[PDB]
Structure formats: C-alpha cells, structure tokens
Amino acid sequence: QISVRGLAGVENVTELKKNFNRHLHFTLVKDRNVATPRDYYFALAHTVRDHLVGRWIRTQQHYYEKDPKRIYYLSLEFYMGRTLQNTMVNLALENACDEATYQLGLDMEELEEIEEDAGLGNGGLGRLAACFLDSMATLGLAAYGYGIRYEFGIFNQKICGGWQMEEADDWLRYGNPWEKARPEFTLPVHFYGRVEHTSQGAKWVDTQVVLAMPYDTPVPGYRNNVVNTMRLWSAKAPNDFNLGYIQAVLDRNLAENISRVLYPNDNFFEGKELRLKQEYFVVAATLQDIIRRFKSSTNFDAFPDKVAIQLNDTHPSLAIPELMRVLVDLERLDWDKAWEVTVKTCAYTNHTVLPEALERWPVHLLETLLPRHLQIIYEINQRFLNRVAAAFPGDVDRLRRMSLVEEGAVKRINMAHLCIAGSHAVNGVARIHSEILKKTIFKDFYELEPHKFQNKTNGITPRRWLVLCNPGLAEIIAERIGEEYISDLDQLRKLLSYVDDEAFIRDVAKVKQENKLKFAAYLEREYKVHINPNSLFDVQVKRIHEYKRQLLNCLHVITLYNRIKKEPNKFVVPRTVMIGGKAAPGYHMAKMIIKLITAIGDVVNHDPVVGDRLRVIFLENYRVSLAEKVIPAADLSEQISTAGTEASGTGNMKFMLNGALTIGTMDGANVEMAEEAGEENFFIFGMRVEDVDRLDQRGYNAQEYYDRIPELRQIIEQLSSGFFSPKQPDLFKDIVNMLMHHDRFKVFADYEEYVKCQERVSALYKNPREWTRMVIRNIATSGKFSSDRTIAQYAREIWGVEPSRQRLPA
Template sequence: MDARYRSRDLGRKAVDVDALKRSFLEWLVYSVGKDSKTATRRDWFASGALSVRDRVVDRWMDTTRGVYASDAKRIYYFSMEFLIGRLLSNNLANLGLTDACREAVDRLGLRLEEVLEAEPDPALGNGGLGRLAACFLDSMATRNLPAYGYGIRYEYGLFEQRFDQGWQVEFPDNWLRFGNPWEFARPEVLYPIHFHGRVENFIDTKGQERRRWVDTETVHAMAFDTPVVGFGGETINTLRLWSARATSDFDFHHFNDGDYMKAVESKVLSENLSRVLYPNDATAVGRELRFKQEYFFTSASLQDILRRYMQHHQNFDALPEKAAIQLNDTHPAIGIAELMRILLDIHGLDWDKAWDLTRRTFSYTNHTLLPEALETWPVSMLERVLPRHMQIIYDINARFLEQSWGRYDMETIRRLSLIDENGERRVRMGGLAFLGSHKVNGVSALHTDLMKRTVFADYHREFPDRITNKTNGITPRRWLHQANPALSRLITSRIGEGWITDLEQLASLRDRVDDEVFVEEFRRAKRQNKKRLAAYIARHLRIDVDVDSLFDVQVKRIHEYKRQLLNLLQTVALYNQIRDNPLGEFVPVTKILAGKAAPAYHQAKLIIKLANDIAGVINNDPQVRGRLKLVMLPNYNVSQAEIIMPAADLSEQISTAGMEASGTGNMKLALNGALTIGTLDGANVEIREHVGADNIFIFGLTAAEVQDLRQGGAFDPRQVVAANPHLKRALDMIATGAFSPDDPGRFRPIVDSLLNGDHFLVTADFEDYRNAHAAAAALYRTPRDWAEKAILNVAGMGWFSSDRTIMEYARDIWNVSPVLPMAGEAD
C-alpha cells in the first residue's frame, strides 16, 4: 500500500490483520445477528463488506469536504447502466487490503475466495455501456476528479440467463434479495417526478407569457448512495442511484372496502419505474415504461444537481462552470428538455439564457452507428407522457431549423429536424442530444470519423467543431490487477507497481520478450488462468476441456452484427476438416462463447440455440477425440468475465466493419495476453496500431469496402456460398438438421437470412476469417512465438487505460481539475 494512505487516511479504522478479524466478528454478531458457528458464506460476506465499508466512510466524507471547500466544478455522469461488478474484491484491492483480509479470514477458518464469491453481481447493466461507465467511475476516483455517477437502482437486472435444452430462458435477476451492504439509503433525498397532465399558459408578475405543467401524476425518486473507491483510497466518489417510491403506500378507502389489490395498485405501478433494467420494449406498454425510466432518473438527477448548486450560488450564471453533465448515450437525452423546463418554467429565465446554459453544461457520448439503436420516441407518446417537454422540443427544433432555412434543400432540412416525419412522427433523441450539447464524442477513431460521415453528417456540417474523439479505455485495476493476480504479480516483480495507475509503463515489457525466464513465467501464469476457467466450465457445465488447447473466446451481447454466427460457421468447417482427416494433426481448440440475447430478439436467441446444438454434436463425437470443444456459458456477467478474460488465448472481435463503435472486451482480452482475431472495426484499428500489425490477426472487409459492397448492389451471397465448398457444406448441415435431428428445419431462418441478403456480410468474410484462424493455429504450434506476441499485446495496451480516456474528457470536454480530500476532525 502507498505510504501516504495508511490506516488514518483510510478512514481512521485500523487495517492490520487483528483489527480486520475483530471487525468481521463484531459485524457478524451485531449487524448480521449470527455467531461464527452458524454463519453462512453470505453472512461472512455481509460482515466483511460492512467491515471494509467502515474503512471507506471517513475518507468518503473527506472527499466531499474537499470538493465543497474548493467549490470545484463537478462531473455528473448520467448512465442507464453501471456494471460495477462485485465490490468487496474491488474495494479490498483498491485499498490495498487484500492480503491482510485474506489472513484475517484465514484465521477465522475461511477462504477469502469463498467469501468473495458469495457477493452477487449488482444487476445494474447489460453490456459494454455499463462496463464502460464502471471503468470511468473507477478512473475518476483514482485520478481525484470530483464526480457523481447517476442512474437507477434496479431491483431486478436484465435477467438471469439459463439454458433449457439449449434455448435461452430468462429468470428474474433478484440481486437485492439479501440486501446490499455497500449502499446508504437516503430517504431524506426525495424528489417529485411528474408525468402526464397538461400545460397551461399564464402571464407572470413581469407581464411575460409563461407556461406551467399542471394536473400531473407524481412519483418520488429516492436516493441510494454507493461509495466509489479510487485506487489507494485517497478519493472516494459517489454513485447515486434512484429508486421509485409511490406518493402514498396504499389507498385506505379501497383497503377498508376489501379491495386489497386496488388499494396498492398505484404504489405498484409507480414503483415499476425502478423495477427492471430494460423492460421488454416489444409492446407499447413496455416502450412507455422504458421512456419513463429514462426521464425518471434524469429528472431526479437534475433536481439533485441544481439543489447542490444553489446551496452556494444566487443565480444560474455559473452553472456551466460548476457542473459538467455527460450523457452516456441517448437514454438521458430528455434531460436537455428537462433542464430547459426547470430554468424556463420554475426559475423564470428567458429562452436564450436557458438554452446557452443548457448547451454549455451538457455533453454527449454516442455509442452506435446503428440507426435502430439511435433512440426515437413517438411524438404522440411524448405529448401524452411529457407534454411540456414536447413543446420545448418543438421550440428547440423550430429555432434551429429557422437558422438553417434557405441554406439547405428540403431533404436536408428533413434530416436535420428533430422530428422524423416518415410514417409515425418520432422524436430523434440523438439529434436532441447533439443540439443540446457543446461537445459530442465518439468512442474510437474509426467510429468518430464515421459519425461525421454518416449518422451526424448534416449536424457536423452545421457544427464542424462539436464532434471529437475519445477512444474508450478500461480500468487496469479490475481488469488486470484484480482479475489476473498471477500476471499482475509477474509484471510488478519486473517493473514495480506503478503500472496500476500509469498503464503506459507496460511498454517496458517489450524488453522482456528475450528474457526466457520471464517468457516461461508468463506462459505459466496463462496456464494457471486456463486451469481456473477449465475448472469453472467443469463445475457449471460438466464439460472437460483441454487446458493446453487454444482457448478461443467470444464473449459479448448476442447480436447479428457481432457475428457469433461467423464464429459458428468456422467451427462447423473445422469440425468437418477433423472428421475428414481423423489421423490428421490439428491444434486442439476450445471455443468459448457467452452472452445474452434480448428477450424479444428472436434471431439472436436462435443463434444461442444453434451454438448449443452444435456443441452437443461436436463435444460428443468420438471421431473428434477432444481436438475441438465448443462451450456456451450461461449468464455472462462481470464476475464470469473476470475468469474468462485472463484465460483467453485468442480474442474474437469479428463484427462487420463499421458497425462496432469501439468495444472494450477487445481491450480487456489483449491486456490479459490474448491475441486478437478481428476486423478493422471500432478500437481494433487502434489496437493494431499499438500492439503492432504482426501481433494481431486482421481479416475481412474494411468499413469502406462494406459500404461500397452494400451500395453497389452486386453482392450475391448465394454466389459466394456456391464458390466456397467449406461454407456451403456448413450451411447445408445447419439447414438440413445435422445439428437438430429432432427438428431439421429449426435453423432454416438463419440460413435463409444469409442466402437472401446477408446484411452483415458473414458469407463475404468467411473465407478470409477461416484463413486467419488457420494462421492463428499455425502460430499456436510454436508456444514460444505465441507467448512473445502475447507479451507484446500486453505491453502495447497502456494507451487503452480508462485513466487516459477520463483525463482527455476532463481536459477537452469537462474542463474539470483534480481535487484532493480535506480531512475533518478526528474522532
């Protein structure tokens, strides 16, 4: 632990082994209400979390004092997701207490790993968006930046994924079933959130025409705070999550009449707002609930920010100098209209002043080029649910288009408009976020360039200085120091522990590729991690995998553009090669896939079933003799990723070029010594630049070639398939039921989608992808050469630290500086 942050600085609570052991026992008895003889692993986790929390709280308060004393500008990060992962292991590592805690737990007759595994993953996100937000929170605290994360305290996550005969089945992810020892309920922090109602005009005392929103339905947002521990324990920031509370618990009149369901109906409907992450939006009711969720947390957060700001300021003139609000994707974009409403209707500012303050306060991160992922909401829904906000959006749009009128043709004007008039009239939330922000950033160099040329081309022409690039990064604390202790210890033994907060120091590992002792220890660390993953697979799926085989990993949300299907087709082609040459020498390969499909995304769920059906055939074929295994792990989450990432040899990053904004899984896998096989998409482009073109397997069409192929109209997937016997055979097997004899036509929709259009160009990239796999297998035959390239991948990943990303945001977008804590009076 850094000498600056010994026991007094870590919260005036002793951090020696005896003190930790005593805290564990005291919390177990006086909070959990158990003794050591009857305590379960979950009880020990709760007492351990509360013991560590004790050592955080004072420093947390010191951080707040420092920010208030300096009246510093704060960062407010708005995100629908925060996939923060288990916090006990993370906080122990960031406080430097892991070894002391391990010894304390050992003296109690326990294993620390068993205690850590009792903690559920907080179900506050689904994929890359939430994992990125969690990395950013860690970096902001580590870099002493004054910051709040704002989101929703979901009672249930997206879902717990299980497989029933290979099909994805969704179950409630009740992560709060046993409480959450890390959070602090703030019942006194309660804000009204309004819906529906109507807007009326009136004349204020100054004779100005004003509007007010009346006759609304009201829900309350209650705050729950979780401390965010920076590495070293110096700065402790806050993640504030909102939980919906009804304005009254139940209707006493209905209760006395015996209508008990009616008595609590209003409470249940109100509190649904924070019930589930991403309610199914396949129905109108689900879409409205999702939109209400977005407004719910955004409005509560803005009320909280303005309340904090007004404690020290008489007017709003300095708001952009004291608050930087970052919109993580379009989900919180309604906040632009909400801040305008508050400034206009509640505080009486004129339009121009309110708009200037709003635009200078907000900035927006775009995460997608997929049109369907850029949110739009029906105008009719907004007029009903948020009538005043719809008026404000109309006004924003009218004033903007008035400036553009006469300079563009009508088609361009239609594209610039915040209202999409094609078919059902819809509000373009990406456009609202763009117009209402002073900076708009992409998340990789390629993505940002494509933003300028595609989805925001017209806005970019209007505001050429607004779009900027901030390539994503990952926190080295969780994704190497914590997740991969074997490699972390090896690196520290050679270059010291400075890399944990300055990842660029990994570059010095390039000098170690000729150090045979280091290379051998690196290989040993990788094998240790592979053994851990193999044990996990055996325990959960009862499948034995060869630890010395090539671990080929694709873990991410199941989506057609991410092309798990391309991976499966190559798997079938390899399977056929092995069967055709039973005496041939093949590099043993273990294919590992994981990821969830959205409940209403039927094609993605069919791909999961296909993966499991292919695995059932391959893994049980005696002719293969273990030279190829396919494993589909259920319920992918952060904790599972922490086991998979360190064990991977090959990292599958194979999205259709031009469709992945950035990716962060590619960074985590490379940082842990996996070689990437991928297209030139998202951050793969920059990874190649940093690790070296010779240390990555690039294949397939470029983004420009994809665009040309689609626009040219000459691409015929049937011709491609007919010309490629390996691809044709694999598709024929899938289409005719070789992997689904119980239902031969089950996967016909997948094959038809490829033969009739193949929008994601799976067939076009197949042969190049297969050749890239052959190159990877050939390299794996020479373990020393593979290890050298893996080390060079680790050494080249320093630039991909979220610390670098966050400091670029702070400098170029937020204009926020670090603030050191201010110690209060000693106890």
C-alpha cells in the first residue's frame, strides 16, 4: 500500500503464504477449520521469525570472527512492547506480509493486536533501554542487552469505580515465539554464606546456589541485516536443592521467585531483599557470561579494550564489586591492577535527582546476603577516601559527604557513590540534568574528577516511534525527501523548505485528522466512549507522580469547566483532555490522583450545559502498545513537571516527532526541544530552575496563591466541599491538605502562567493553517532526538567504538 513499507514481490508473497500454512499445520497443529485469530497470529509470528534466524546466526559468528569490542548494556528493565510489526519493519517485510495475509483472507492489523506487550519495564528508563537496543543494532555495534526474564511484567491496570485495580501480567501464558531458551548455557549464582581468609586470598564458602538460565531474543537493526541479542536470565533451583520430600520440591519456588515479578514502583527505592537478590542475580550471571566470551575469543589488561559495561542507573551497580571479586579472588590479580581494569570497563548513567529514587542499601542486608561484596566495598571506600583526603587536606566534611558508607540510624551504602568511584564515565540524560548533577548532587565528585562527567541527551527510535506507529506521516514525508531519514533523522530538517507549501500543509493536517478518527473509533470499540474528533486532543500520558504534576492539569480542566458554567453561551475551543498512566501499587497519593481525574470526568462529561465542548477521559492501562496509538493522535503534549525534577523525559520526544505541539516547563529535554525548534514554536511557561530555588530559599507558602487567585480559590473550595464527590464529601481531603500545606512540587506557583499559556494554545488552534505550520517546524527539527544520535555519542565518547551503517550479507 505505502512506499516505506517495502516491496510485495510475487515470489516473496508466494513463499510467505506457504510458510504460513506450514507453521499453522506442523507448528500449531491446526487447520483452518478450527483455527482462531490467535492461531493465525502465531503462524505469522513463526513465519517472520524464520527470516531472522539466518541473519541472527551469521551476525553472531561474524562477531566471533572479527572479535570487535563488545558493548554490554546491563538493565533491570527492557520495555520492549510488541515484536511482530517492529520485526517486519526492520526486515522490510511489512507490505509482503500484508499482501500474503490478505490473499489468505486475513487482516494483518487485527492479528497484530493479539500479541501481548513484553512489559518488562515501568516506563521511561525501561523504554529507553529498548530504544537503545534498536539503535545499537541499526548502527552495527556488537552490543548485548542483559536483564531478567520476569514471569510477570508491569501489572495490567483496570479502573473500577474510578479506582486503580492491579492484575498480574501473565504475558507468557500463550508462549513467546520470539525467545529461544539456551538451557545449555545455565550458570550458578551464589548467595549468603561466609568469607574465609586463607594463606592465599579470601574464599566465599557455604553459599546457597541458584541457577541462571538464559533466554535469547533477537534484536534486528533497520534493514542492515544485523541481528543482535538481548539475553534475559531466569531463576532455576538446583536439583540437589533441599536434598519431607514433597515440601522440599515445593520449596524450590523460594529460589525461583527471584525472576518472578518486576517491582512496579517506577523505580522509587524500596530496600527489599528480593530486589537486591534480583540485582545481584543479573550482575553475577552476566559477568560470568562476559568473561567466558572474552576468554573464548590470560592477560586482563586487554579486557577494557574488548569489553564495555554500561550500568543503566545503579540497579546493576554490584557489577563493580563483583568484577573486583572475580579478578582478585578467582583470577588472582593484584588489587590495583583489578581496579584499573574495572574502572576502564565500567560506565554509569544516572537517570534522576529525586532523593527517594536513590539506592541506599542497609549494610546489614549486604552483610548477610553478600558478605564478600561488602568487604570489597569497604576497601574501595577506604582507598577512594584516601584519594579525597590527599586532594583536599583537612576537609573533613567532604570526606563524610563523599563516603560510599552513610552513617546514621542504620548504616547504608550509597550505590551512586560506588558507581562514580568505579566508572571512567558518568553521564546525565539531558543537558540541564547533567549540569544539575555537577552543580549539586555530585558536586564533590565533579571537583575531584571533572573528566568523568559527561552528558548524553536521551532519544527515541524513529522506527517504532514514527514508521511503525504513524505510517501515514512517514509516507508523506518520504514522498518529499526520500526514505533516508529513517536512519538519519537529521534529514527531517529538509522539511523546513515546505513550511509554506500548501500541499504539504494540507497533507500533514490530513494525516493528523485520520489518526484522530482512528483513535476516536478505538475508544468506542474496545472501551466504549464517545469523543468529538474535531476537538483539540490534549494529552498527558506517563506514570502518575506528584512531580509530573497531573494535578496541575486537573486544576486547568476544572478552570475550563467553571468558565463554561460561568458564561455558557460564550464560544470556546473544544477539547477532549486525556490523561493516562499507572500508579505504583503502594503510592496512596498517586491512586487518589487517578480517582480525582475520573471524578472530574464524571461531572464534566455529564453536564448538559458543557455539551461536547469539553471531555475528560482517563486512558486505562497505558503501556507501549497504547502509546503507539494515542501519540499519533495527539494535538497537544503536556510536559509540565516542576522545573528540575524530570531528568529528561522521552514521551515528550515521541509527541514532537508525531505532529503535536508541546506545552511545558523548561525541564529536562524540553529545554533542548525548544532550542531546536525555536522558543516561538513551543508553549513554554512557569518557573525555571532558578525560580524554584529562589522560592525554596524564601519558603513556599501555597496560602499566598490561594488568597490572591479567585479562580484557584473556587477550585479548592469545590474539592473540599465535595463538589466532585457528593456521596463522599471529604474524599479528596488528603489532596487539598497536600496542596495547601506540604506540596514539594509547587503546583499553585505555576497555575496562573499555565492557564494563560493554555489560552494561547486555544488561540492558535482556531487558526488551522498556522497551527499546522508550527507543527511542521517542530517535526522538522526533531532530528536531534533520535536515539541513533544518542547511541553514536555513547559509542564515540564513552565506549570507544565507531558506529557503522554498512549492511551485512544475507
């Protein structure tokens, strides 16, 4: 149908059809008389999978032959989403499969909807790892993603009575056609035990053993025939395990629970033992795998020249002490040599400045679970502080501040400090974030080793986030500048010469309207809800957090509602406000915010006077597959976190690439997005980081705003009086109390500027032509936000490897 989807050659379609029928018969053991859509989905998945094998096998032996420097990306999360369409796109098989299935009397689009999302992540951090894998394969890097194969990913969210209900994400129920178990490469992981000091070195003995079984998933690059590997570990109990008899076998579940479920707290620190076990589990198995591959290609001096280990936040921070343990205790290298190798091998990426997200493990936990590692950490700390003392003689408080060991109620190990000390590079994920790291949180470390600190602004893959989810937009773009931009997003800048092209302006607007119609239909089909396709689609989708300020959005919605009720017959630009996102199961306030959103909808959506001028919808179960549907349909992207709290953000980049204008604060990557597109083409409002600091020095008093802004006062009084909860008048008391007395994120402080900025958005929207021209200016300058640019920078500035665009043989 469309160009960018590849060719549908006669011999290709014929081949696909026969292989489809072959899998349906021999693999699924069914025939078209009893086959259901799910059977058809699997037949298609196995057919497409077959086309990956040849490339996967030769890519890997290619690396074995050339022995390039290998990149290991360690992460506890990989938010992959669906794999079928992405694979077809990268292999240029989409139109051929579309034709083949069509000829078989099947709609490929409905078969794709059957696949379960691989939701092995919470949100931004997990999705970043996924985009990174796609870009590393596309850039021809010998990269490996290493993580945990969770039996249960992020929970599925259901809304009952306006409240969030959680249910297990049993994503492996029907099987996973994309993975390949490699039980033959199973490795042992040790826990507990004690340390023995012999004549020659320490020994970790009397340990409990848990096996790590790897499962490999292919990661195809964009049409370059490169297929890398994502290896995820699954926990298995040994067979001598617990060896009355029956109970011993049932207790095997104790050890296998390590890979059972993903913690769903959007990575806010919860010092639970199971979480620590997961972190060591991935680190221990991965490192053995890395060393094995290194020895099978003993001077470890060349180790850093053949290996790069990237720590995705501090979750895999134990890789530092574990690498030291292996080199010193097992390989017998002297400490200083082992440390040199470790530092040159490891690099650390920080993803947030929020204090409650930083990992600070109780010493007593490490002491019991990983005795040897605690000893190694103490030694690292001693030697590190000796260096600090030599550089800043007499500065005793600096020694206390920089220590890896934190004193107080209970001793804790600051994992961020451990990562900085043991890595040759430390980076933030957006310019403003990286600067904040050097000015505040890690100031002392920056002063000691300035050369270690870098910035690597985040990005998103244009394959999944443009070509896959918005073929219509990708097509009209390709018609003008070709298809080269798909792997070189900077070429989108060529579109600036079309900002005055009436034809292009019309097509851009047409694509958006089509996406909105498609989404409006979806809302009614799988969830039943009417929405005016001719209204402005105001969208805020991301995890529910106080720092992301969904509450500020709520205040604006209520303001719009009160103004309409005030002057019913006055004209206002119609809007359908959509808010979606999951709340951590034990985050009370986050759950109350979801309830408030639905409560507002209950009132607004049923007010006769409002009509179809304002609708408020809470998008249930926000996840990667849903993002692929709602983002292309958005007109306005809400990125309104308090300045200085959102390290980068990536959803913001997805909206920019898909034709939505952005209303937001100068926070995270928003700053760079506005710089690229031009401030006049962005809806910027609110306090800047400097303003937030001034307010804190003075002392934030929410009452001041309440007393000076009549419209704000009215909203609070409505919330407090039970206007949005007639049966439970004081239902939102906690929310009001927080806003009025302990709001760490200053919602009221940005209210006035936010509402005014929103008025300007509405003004531009009623002038279709100028709205679309601004959209074109945004799409045209979104090139910097391709994860291909991000990965190329990591490769050249941190890993020491040159990216390649050269395609491999088939």
